[PDB]
Symmetry: D2
Subunit: 287 residues, 4 copies
């Protein structure tokens, strides 16, 4: 009996409510998240683009850019990884299927696909365009049919709220779930009551994207639990703090000609080694 | 056709010592460029510990490094110096393939060290190094492989802690004699030593000012007085980024919200300016 | 620094028409070089069917192609023309990244076409070609992305078979005006037709002389009389290699030994001479 | 969840000896499957010479091999045995990462050999091998790294040409004792030698029936009589494919047309059938 990351994700959902899922920009951070106690992690599409590629989150990253990060993370971290698969990386069902099979093989526990048109953008940006309900239903059907591991999770994300309104978005959500979506990700929700409306309407686990500096308030896990949201996602939180800290080191070093004044803000060598189990490896070499 | 190696050599001429900062990923390379740096570095310890979440013990492969080189140089135009450990392989063919692949991936130069196969950080105890002759062969193979004459082949020696200063300097002389264009005397403990290496080899000397190791935190003024050509800060940004990430993860887990650490975060606008986001979005909307 | 694109342009002035053969992998690129060819080709159909064992229906990713470009150009010095389909993405950003990535990978040039998604690949006759304006946008994005001025941006049009000769010529003129440096008109069946395109655009014209299709197997003499600048044989060696491989598999399975097909095999020495084996091994023996 | 290694082991019990053919790329893996084979092989000499156009001298990287494993196993369901040379690195950490990475890539098993660093074909002269103790360490590292219990760890020994039959058999016994699940005695020159290895280790034995080397072209009946469980043909199709391609290139260059060699080519309809083309288009 082989281990299923998808089965581990589903199990995590039953043990934590809402299940906190944090984005992990790279393998090192996945280990840090695990050491912090999280039971599930996330590979942000915006993070692969802005972090790994230094590019805008506008459909520029490819399937392989993402697979590279999935392998890096899952090769060392045992926590189930939910992956942002944007629109499936292609214009047809064959592309969606290749995406699902490849991510399962790379080690992911699940993925979400959204209803945006080709060159997608952040759900917290204006002027987004979405495909017809029927088109997304076909994306979803193709994804579910491609599952090689029955416990792998296929989540549907809808960006329809800001575009067509709440009722239209709920209607799409119901159609997406009827089409096979196993969990729902209603993006950029502005009021807590909306999560409850979605939850009651589709009756499958609901994910709340609590990302910073967007259209969504910073809801607490208590508030989210009261609206019956199954998981709380913090997609780029650590990434944002890491960038400010790195920027600070770069500026100080440039202005002062030494990093002495920011040593206090750095993870120590020992803390790094502890994080990656360094001593156990070096001891083996020494012997 | 633009040569990154040529740009690196040029940077050396305009700044002395030339500050070179490690960039863990493409995003940070852009932040380093915006901070004014003229050259950047791809740390082997960072590819291992950061990109792979593994110890810096010769576990990373040439391709793990090539992936990060392309990601960084595809978006950042600053010359990138790359840590190539011992050449990724048992023979001169592996060293040559490493050199040609890194040049093609967009690097400006690389350094190869004299450690045995499963190398370790120059600041760790119990290092093992190959014979002077064996290292000379690795350097000869690397130099002969250059497809871009301006690409830089830098030699690193870890012999100070293993054989002493005089032995380390003798190796450095042999390495440069064999074709190494720049020298990286690892884990120096006293400022005066940099001057001795500089005088002995007559090629640019790089001082590795990494934290929590055997080397004091020398300032650029101090390094300049010792005739150091380059001041390297390999993982400085990475160490701060890790502490900050850990803080966010801990607070979110304990508090059930990130409200209390919002002030420690780069804002969305700052991120967008960093990656030239608005230029791309404007094109799409038009 | 050597420019593959500059080498391709040079080969065009020394041979007319310039024979360009598809090379399915690095080994065959070396065989082509030994046979005397001055330029080679990375077929999109070959990357799909050969490297991935899949149909040429928009399933391959940019990275699948880049891997083959690096393998071939890392060892073979001949200029490599690459099939870049529609740019591997839905926007001008994807086209630009494809161009820059292929240049870095070592290619001498590429051709981009005017189909919608993989609709023409799927043989759909209606609404399968983008508007002239949309293709001009792809071309301008490709040309502006050139990091090496000598890299070649060729335009391929799949319109003759669906819109007629007049429309295909009109598209071709608009494409060349937008920046296309050479033209690849597909589905031509008459020599006179090649001549018409040549006079209409006044840039080098490529004739696709693939087997088992509508196009007759024109000779280089015939093509020269029609003002064709280059003759492409995209999968020729690949087709013969597959029949030979299948034969070995069949004989081995029927007989329990490969004794009877040894005479159809490249000998070990022939392989060694092709990859310069002995010069490498001797260096190892003399350490 | 399906385990490729479990499938490989099952294939052994259903075919005696099990014919394993080298598949240079995903397309040929499908050709092998369509031809009736039950197991396939990813040759290290093929990744080097074919995918990279380079000598089989330890120049290929783990990544070059992983790419080919994913391409083949993403489309072909047959269990794939992979040539892992010496583990791709200088330490047991590298051997362990190779094992884990190949399992994730989709392989059914792999073989690791006892050569020193920059290895060479087992049919080449002057090869060098590590101590029995060092090989034992590589095998222990490999077996302990298995994330799929049914993944197969095969040990290959190049000792016959260097130290003789008895020393090669002694090493083979130490390797199996260390955990090797199957054995690959390379470049055997006499049929009877296979029976000796078979009797000495009690695990499945693989015979490498490659062309133009030190091993006679033994038939599957001969191999079965010597208690050989697997018959490997690592580059057979590749060699024929190369001659065929060379012929096309030469004829086309000399004649200015490929008309005279059309009869040596797989047709487009045959190509489409081998990759299930029309099955795709319709959807
Ligand atoms: Mg996203
Ligand atoms: Mg290092
Ligand atoms: Mg081999």
């Amino acid at each position: 009996s082989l281990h299923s990351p998808g089965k581990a994700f589903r199990a995590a959902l039953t043990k934590e409510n809402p299940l906190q899922i944090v984005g992990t920009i790279n393998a090192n951070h996945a280990l840090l998240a695990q050491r912090a106690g999280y039971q599930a992690i996330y590979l942000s599409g915006g993070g692969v683009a802005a972090g790994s590629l230094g590019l805008p989150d506008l459909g520029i990253s490819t399937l392989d850019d993402v697979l590279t990060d999935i392998r890096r993370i899952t090769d060392v971290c045992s926590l189930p990884l939910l992956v942002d698969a944007d629109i499936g990386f292609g214009s047809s069902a064959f592309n969606v299927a290749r995406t699902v099979k490849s991510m399962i093989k790379a080690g992911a526990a699940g993925l979400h696909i959204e209803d945006q048109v080709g060159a997608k953008r952040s759900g917290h940006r204006p002027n987004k365009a979405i495909v017809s309900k029927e088109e997304m239903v076909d994306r979803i059907r193709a994804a579910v049919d491609a599952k090689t591991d029955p416990d792998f999770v296929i989540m549907a994300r809808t960006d329809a709220l800001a575009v067509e309104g709440l009722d239209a978005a709920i209607e799409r959500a119901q159609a997406y779930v009827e089409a096979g979506a196993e969990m729902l990700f209603p993006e950029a929700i502005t009021e807590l009551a909306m999560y409850r409306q979605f939850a009651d309407a589709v009756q499958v686990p609901i994910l709340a994207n609590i990302t910073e500096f967007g259209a969504t308030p910073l809801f607490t896990t208590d508030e989210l639990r009261s609206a019956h949201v199954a998981m709380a996602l913090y997609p780029l939180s650590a990434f944002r703090a890491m960038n400010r800290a790195a920027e600070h080191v770069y500026n100080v070093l440039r202005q002062e000609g030494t990093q002495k004044s920011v040593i206090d803000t750095m993870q120590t060598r020992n803390e790094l080694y502890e994080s990656i189990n360094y001593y156990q490896y070096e001891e083996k070499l020494d012997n």
